[PDB]
Scaffold this active site. Structure first.
Site, short mmCIF file in Angstrom:
data_model
loop_
_atom_site.label_atom_id
_atom_site.label_comp_id
_atom_site.label_asym_id
_atom_site.label_seq_id
_atom_site.Cartn_x
_atom_site.Cartn_y
_atom_site.Cartn_z
N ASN A 222 -9.92 -3.22 3.78
CA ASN A 222 -9.89 -3.15 2.32
C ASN A 222 -11.30 -2.93 1.76
O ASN A 222 -12.28 -2.97 2.50
CB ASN A 222 -9.31 -4.44 1.73
N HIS B 297 0.82 -1.22 0.00
CA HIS B 297 0.00 0.00 0.00
C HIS B 297 0.86 1.27 0.00
O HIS B 297 0.63 2.18 0.79
CB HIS B 297 -0.98 0.02 1.18
C1 HEM Z 1 -6.21 -9.29 6.41
C2 HEM Z 1 -6.26 -8.48 5.35
C3 HEM Z 1 -5.40 -7.20 5.30
C4 HEM Z 1 -5.87 -5.97 5.12
C5 HEM Z 1 -7.35 -5.59 4.95
C6 HEM Z 1 -4.74 -5.05 5.12
C7 HEM Z 1 -4.81 -3.68 4.97
C8 HEM Z 1 -3.73 -2.83 4.88
C9 HEM Z 1 -3.77 -1.40 4.62
C10 HEM Z 1 -5.05 -0.56 4.40
C11 HEM Z 1 -2.52 -0.94 4.62
C12 HEM Z 1 -2.13 0.53 4.38
C13 HEM Z 1 -2.43 1.33 5.65
C14 HEM Z 1 -2.42 2.80 5.33
O1 HEM Z 1 -3.48 3.32 4.90
O2 HEM Z 1 -1.36 3.45 5.51
C15 HEM Z 1 -1.62 -2.05 4.88
C16 HEM Z 1 -0.25 -2.01 4.95
C17 HEM Z 1 0.58 -2.98 5.48
N1 HEM Z 1 0.27 -4.33 5.64
FE1 HEM Z 1 -1.67 -5.05 5.49
N2 HEM Z 1 -3.59 -5.80 5.31
C18 HEM Z 1 -3.95 -7.13 5.42
C19 HEM Z 1 -3.09 -8.19 5.61
C20 HEM Z 1 -1.76 -8.09 5.99
C21 HEM Z 1 -0.94 -9.15 6.52
C22 HEM Z 1 -1.38 -10.61 6.77
C23 HEM Z 1 0.28 -8.66 6.77
C24 HEM Z 1 1.48 -9.44 7.34
C25 HEM Z 1 1.40 -9.98 8.57
C26 HEM Z 1 0.28 -7.26 6.40
C27 HEM Z 1 1.34 -6.39 6.50
C28 HEM Z 1 1.33 -5.04 6.21
C29 HEM Z 1 2.43 -4.13 6.45
C30 HEM Z 1 3.81 -4.46 7.06
C31 HEM Z 1 1.93 -2.76 5.96
C32 HEM Z 1 2.70 -1.43 5.99
C33 HEM Z 1 2.32 -0.72 7.28
C34 HEM Z 1 2.91 0.66 7.32
O3 HEM Z 1 4.00 0.87 6.73
O4 HEM Z 1 2.29 1.54 7.96
N3 HEM Z 1 -0.99 -6.94 5.93
N4 HEM Z 1 -2.40 -3.18 5.03
#
Ligand code: HEM
Ligand code: HEM
Ligand SMILES: *[C@@H]1O[C@H](CO)[C@@H](O)[C@H](O)[C@H]1NC(C)=O
Ligand SMILES: *[C@@H]1O[C@H](CO)[C@@H](O)[C@H](O)[C@H]1NC(C)=O
Ligand SMILES: *[C@@H]1O[C@H](CO)[C@@H](O)[C@H](O)[C@H]1NC(C)=O
Lengths: 681, 681
Positions: free
Chosen positions: B140, B67
């Site tokens: 999401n 993202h």
């Molecule tokens: C279950 C469904 C998931 C959804 C709905 C989701 C949603 C999101 C969203 C919206 C962001 C961006 C946040 C923003 O607006 O700045 C993000 C980033 C990220 N996601 Fe997920 N995610 C999911 C699953 C995962 C999983 C399983 C992992 C690993 C364990 C993961 C790891 C990350 C990481 C490391 C970031 C970057 C965070 C940051 O730099 O602030 N995500 N995700």
């Protein structure tokens, strides 16, 4: 026959025929988290999960502050002769002497993920892994830069990059702040004109010339020097797209240039450039109507001709993009014995900036130890410690002077140890000032020279480009300020540009007008030396045995060295690509195979396999973008449907043998400029 | 009616009417480098140059690992009542209780500079600045996710991200590795179907629903608990583009969604969403044919209907994108009193991942001290030091337990201090195991349920999406594996997709076939509740008084809440945009003003002011992509030239009064699906 990446083989890792492990060894699995029960919570003691995720979480490093979007490859430079008469550089010191090289091409303003085919100044950074240290020529595809002092670089880059409140627009100078700066800082006008011409939207990295831009010094063994300009001359020939094509290509394929470079090297068509230099004496600094220390000016070839020193050829792609291409750290401060800087205020500031910016990107001092950054000449000094220290130093006496270390590592200068030395004749004289020289004041003469040296249609592209970008400016006074500055370069240009904006251009200002012309600043004017690796789209159909003779057409074109793609409704036997995945922007020439008229017409042009009018849109776009089009046999009715006659230039209708001969020689012309309207009917 | 960014005012810096300074104070100038002589070298002692350039060189921080490409805005959440009966959450504790919020929308795969209109899953992160700490619902626009365990997250992203050797393709799943993972890991198939539908290419951020995906817990004062699913229901209604439209839009305007959100808020049309929940009892976790701990499944509304809790309205754009939007650090671990986690293996791993990843991006443990990350409720603990510590703690006794500090800061729990507490009733039972539950085994039923619940034309778009992307896969066996997995979902889908790939995946495998249908999964089925902020392209001309009719047509159209743009050859009095700058992708509806037929045929259609056939292409593209098109009076000739009937659905020919109405009715329909071909015509 020697591999360009031979030194990097020792750090390569083969994971084939192995079990999965951690970063500290020991075989593992990593497809299931450790849970407390069948439907249980994940445990904190799960070391396999955290070590895997921690590495993923910390994958990203900061992108380059400028030139974030780019791509590169490895290669070999070969010197044509012994150039000890002009320079003490070891990599130019003998005939047939080969040096490994890495080149990275890029845009400027766009962030990582932005389009290749956006209008921008392009990067041309080349490293020579020489036997006396790494030498870098960090250049662009345009021979002049926007600003005259390096302190103004943040002001330039802030203005051209997206507006800081909303971060819009992406990878574009078509907005208020950019054209506010160009009008407010009129030294930028020259590079603006180059950026609005074909150099802003080149065909590929292979079809660019390269320039060091700044005047450098080449020093001999005895200390004598000469002023030098670096030039990269493309052997593939210069080629550029049209803007309306470039916009569509940005969305259809943002990886256009990097994939083009990749496919060229893989197919055994390695691109090559010739290294050339303009050599002039020290006393010619202010001789040719401008100052050689000014980076906003280029030296016309009429005063100093190009002198070819060698040839570079890029023949090896990287195996890991991040490790090699992304991590490489170019510096204009990377200088070797036989070369020296000048008092160019823009160059002067770069020497600091590039060394400093690596601290942000690599988050430590030891970035030169990375495999891609390492020299082949050896590193011996008293530098110790720092983050990510990869080596173990044996000398416990890490200082100089010293009796205990026996004077080693020893000092090297001009006479001893072949060490770097500044040009001995260089002097400083005068008051300490925060000023620019009075010889830097002319900002309009060369822009006019460049505009005069283009063809009528090429002059139209520059004006149409300014019209497009200037119309996006919301502020009225800013647009008036732009037309005011354009009027100083040329009244006719200011008049024509003002038409699109709906403003009245100011009255003629004959201070800087002239009718001079210069050699070799053109593109759509000269034909290509080779059509090898050029792309041809063969529009065929699955129904009625049209695909059989489309394969024969493909087979004949490949013999001449062309990259051919047979298009059909679906991926049948012989079909390379579907109409759904096909676009005109991915080809240099569109050819309609015989029996493929059915897909342009009534029943057949409206299949659910592709969007409505897709076959007809490809040929129409190709024709409107100036590409050599064609239609074999009864396929001439396809040309009749789009409204294109079979007489006009760049259109080839007839038998299979005649189409191939016409298409191939049409690709040398590349773009047919007679299809583009000029101002005044 | 309070400012959402009221707390941010204290850290705002106004530079109007001031002199230039360094970061350590003292007035300066920074436009000339300090030189030793008139044309001399730049001095090292120039502290003004280096302090200015150092900050520029170190401007960039690492982008988000996923993202990276996104945009956001501030707002206010309003609760519709006292929800103490279901949750102990403070922001849901009273009727008309307002809480500031920040929401960031995004894609997944693409880097920071990628296009908004790329096909991808879209993020929906919302923070609640509650009076009992920050609460984040990171979600999401699709209710289900690819994988079931969080340890497989690097595997999922690595496959969808560009190939590591060449870093191609950008912001796309249409390549070998992505579809290799989808076939090898069948759990991903469900989200793939959503990603291939209209949810992959939505109209804008304002026209998306939002989902927390995971099953969470809502906890009351006395420890009582209920399973919950979070839902964001858009008041603007769901809307999505077509693929061929989104590709061109990715090149024409890569800042499409972020500009859309910006202009909406700036024009006084703040978008809104309703926060709704599906409440299930603890004993009914595995009662609805699937496991509620499974993230790849969603619960149909007919089993558990939506219960609206409040409304969110985004009505304040940021003043600095980097400081607010780029720097904000969302985490699913940001939980408050009244909410609790579940044993969802995917959710479990996120709690660790999101906290760790901030250490990379922000390069320190004090990222919460950043103004955008700071809570409004206050921070009191024994955390000291670290990189970029912004406070000066007064308590010298920084530990617990302690006599010297009198036990302060004090411990808070369920019964005292209103502290956080895990649900009392939660238990663990069974062997420590690295495996998923047997209830997570079904990967094919719900994908079919989603496909069944779409309209005939929507089902065609999903297949057309798979057809397009699957054809980009070069490896034959990978495509066979894809059809093999698609055949398990649906036979007709497998066979229809197979014909485009040029092979058979025929023999039915009916282990998982069914005809069940559920509500609310479709986009193109429903009509839009409002046409406010919807764009209309008025094709006019500068000759023959056609601009007056376009100006009269503009006001009446903008009276009803639309965002109109007048197109012409150049910027006349009433002209907003040039033809050169105009494109069909920027509008929801297209309308030719009376007298503007001349630009579609003959001499008026070929001007140097715009590319050949531009006016016709805008109307053609608009029609081909299913938009409402129109023409006033004699303007019907424009539609005649492109081969379009005046009678057919979504085309409006007649008087200005009869054009304004109908086009406004057509915008409620938004997309006319009868113009797209279906398999079996
Ligand atoms: C279950 C469904 C998931 C959804 C709905 C989701 C949603 C999101 C969203 C919206 C962001 C961006 C946040 C923003 O607006 O700045 C993000 C980033 C990220 N996601 Fe997920 N995610 C999911 C699953 C995962 C999983 C399983 C992992 C690993 C364990 C993961 C790891 C990350 C990481 C490391 C970031 C970057 C965070 C940051 O730099 O602030 N995500 N995700
Ligand atoms: C005509 C003069 C200039 C040329 C030819 C030029 C060209 C380039 C090129 C080609 C790159 C990308 C290097 C790569 O391939 O990785 C680059 C990056 C960069 N430029 Fe320049 N640029 C110029 C002016 C300046 C100035 C005046 C400054 C400020 C003093 C500056 C600061 C930087 C920095 C900090 C980078 C990032 C380097 C890295 O991260 O490795 N540039 N420039
Ligand atoms: C180089 O260093 C040597 C001693 O190693 C010294 O004698 C000599 O003067 C130096 N060369 C010049 C030209 O300064
Ligand atoms: C143009 O070229 C001529 C060469 O005859 C030169 O003398 C002159 O200085 C140049 N510049 C202008 C503006 O005439
Ligand atoms: C829905 O269809 C499924 C087939 O997977 C079936 O098991 C279930 O009983 C049906 N439920 C109803 C009645 O909606």
């Amino acid at each position: 026959e020697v591999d360009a990446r031979q030194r990097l083989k020792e750090v390569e890792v083969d994971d084939n025929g192995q079990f999965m492990t951690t970063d500290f060894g020991g075989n593992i699995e990593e497809q299931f988290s450790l849970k407390a029960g069948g439907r249980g919570s994940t445990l904190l003691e799960d070391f396999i999960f955290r070590q895997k995720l921690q590495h993923f979480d910390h994958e990203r490093i900061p992108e380059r502050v400028v030139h974030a979007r780019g791509a590169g490859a490895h290669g070999i430079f070969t010197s044509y002769g012994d150039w000890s008469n002009i320079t003490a550089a070891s990599f130019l010191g003998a005939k047939d002497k080969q040096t490994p090289v890495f080149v990275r091409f890029s845009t400027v303003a766009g962030s990582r993920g932005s389009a290749d085919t956006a209008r921008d100044v392009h990067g041309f950074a080349t490293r020579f892994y020489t036997d006396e240290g790494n030498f870098d020529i960090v250049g662009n595809n345009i021979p002049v830069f926007f600003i005259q002092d390096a302190i103004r670089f943040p002001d330039l880059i802030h203005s051209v990059k997206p507006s800081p409140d909303n971060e819009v627009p992406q990878a574009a100078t078509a907005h208020d702040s950019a054209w506010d700066f160009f009008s407010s800082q009129p030294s930028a006008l020259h590079t603006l004109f180059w950026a609005m011409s074909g150099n802003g939207i080149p065909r590929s990295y292979r079809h660019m010339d390269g320039f060091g831009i700044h005047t450098f010094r080449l020093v001999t063994e005895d200390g004598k020097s000469k002023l030098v300009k670096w030039h990269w001359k493309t052997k593939q020939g210069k080629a550029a797209l049209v803007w309306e094509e470039a916009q569509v290509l940005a969305g259809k394929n943002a990886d256009f240039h990097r994939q083009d470079l990749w496919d060229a090297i893989e197919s055994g068509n390695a691109p090559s450039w010739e290294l050339a230099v303009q050599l002039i004496d020290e006393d010619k600094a202010q001789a040719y109507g401008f100052d050689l220390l000014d980076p906003t000016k280029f030296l016309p070839e009429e005063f100093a001709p190009l002198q070819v020193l060698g040839e570079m050829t890029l023949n090896r792609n990287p195996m890991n993009y991040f490790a090699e291409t992304e991590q490489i750290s170019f510096q204009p401060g990377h200088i070797v014995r036989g070369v020296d800087f000048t008092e160019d205020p823009l160059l002067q500031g770069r020497l600091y900036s590039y060394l400093d910016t690596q601290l942000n990107r690599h988050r430590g001092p030891n970035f030169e130890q990375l495999p891609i950054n390492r020299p082949v000449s050896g590193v011996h000094n008293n530098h110790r410690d720092g983050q990510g220290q990869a080596w173990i130093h044996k000398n416990i006496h890490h200082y100089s002077p010293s009796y205990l270390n026996k004077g080693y590592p020893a000092q090297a200068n001009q006479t001893v140890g072949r060490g770097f030395f500044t040009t001995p004749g260089r002097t400083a004289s005068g008051v300490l000032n925060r000023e620019l020289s009075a010889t830097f004041d002319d900002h309009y003469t060369q822009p006019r020279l460049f505009f005069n040296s283009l063809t009528p249609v090429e002059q139209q592209f520059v004006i149409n480009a300014i019209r497009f970008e200037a119309s996006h400016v919301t502020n009225e006074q800013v647009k008036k300020n732009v037309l005011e500055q354009l009027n100083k370069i040329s009244n006719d240009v200011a008049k024509r540009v003002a038409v699109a904006l709906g403003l009245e251009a100011p009255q003629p200002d004959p201070t800087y007008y002239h009718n001079n012309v210069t050699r070799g600043v053109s593109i759509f004017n000269e034909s290509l030396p080779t059509i090898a690796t050029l792309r041809v789209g063969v529009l065929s159909t699955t129904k009625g045995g049209s695909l059989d003779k489309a394969k024969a057409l493909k087979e004949q074109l490949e013999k001449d060295g062309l990259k051919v793609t047979v298009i059909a409704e679906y991926l049948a036997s012989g079909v390379d690509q579907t109409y759904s995945a096909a676009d005109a922007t991915a080809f240099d020439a569109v050819v309609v195979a015989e029996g493929a008229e059915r897909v342009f017409s009534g029943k057949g042009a409206m299949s659910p396999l592709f969007p409505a009018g897709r076959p007809s849109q490809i040929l129409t776009d190709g024709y409107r973008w100036g590409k050599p089009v064609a239609a074999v046999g009864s396929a001439k009715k396809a040309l009749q449907s789009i409204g294109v006659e079979e007489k006009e230039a760049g259109v080839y209708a007839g038998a299979q043998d005649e189409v191939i001969k016409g298409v191939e020689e049409g690709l040398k012309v590349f773009k047919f400029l007679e299809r583009f309207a000029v101002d005044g009917d």
